[PDB]
Amino acid sequence: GLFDIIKKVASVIGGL
Amino acid sequence: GLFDIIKKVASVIGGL
Amino acid sequence: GLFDIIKKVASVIGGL
Amino acid sequence: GLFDIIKKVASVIGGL
Amino acid sequence: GLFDIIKKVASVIGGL
Amino acid sequence: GLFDIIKKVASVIGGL
């Protein structure tokens, strides 16, 4: 789009 | 679209 | 886009 | 417990 | 607890 | 606790 928000997460426990 | 929100998660336990 | 926000997180516990 | 992680969020759109 | 991590966030769009 | 971390954020767009 024209404002783009991306988040990526890695965890052993608890990716909320 | 024209504002785009993306979230990706990896976990051994508890991806909520 | 034309203002792009990216976040990456890595953890043993608790990637909120 | 003996390690406590707390998060609160407010938004009009997209509280992921 | 004995190590305590607190986060609060406000936004119009996108509190991830 | 006995080592306490606190964060507050305000934004129009993107509080990650």
Residues 1..16 of E with a Cβ closer than 8 Å to B: which?
13-14, 16
How many CB pairs below 8 Å do chains B and D form together? 3
The residue of chain D with its CA nearest to that of E2 is: D2
Q: What ranges make up the beta strands (E) of chain D? A: 4-10
Q: CA nearest F14 in A: which residue?
A: A5
* Residue where the block lists tokens 């609060």: E8
Rounded CA-CA distance C8/C1 in Å is 18
Give strand pairing partners of F6.
E6
Distance CA D4, CA B15 (A): 18
Q: Does the distance separating the beta carbons of F15 and E12 come in below 8 Å?
A: no
The rounded distance, in Å, linking the Cα atoms of F3 and E8 is 18
In terms of C-beta density within 10 A (0-12 exposed, 13-18 middle, 19 or more buried), how is residue A2 classed? exposed
Of B6, E5, A9, give the one whose Cα is nearest residue C15: A9
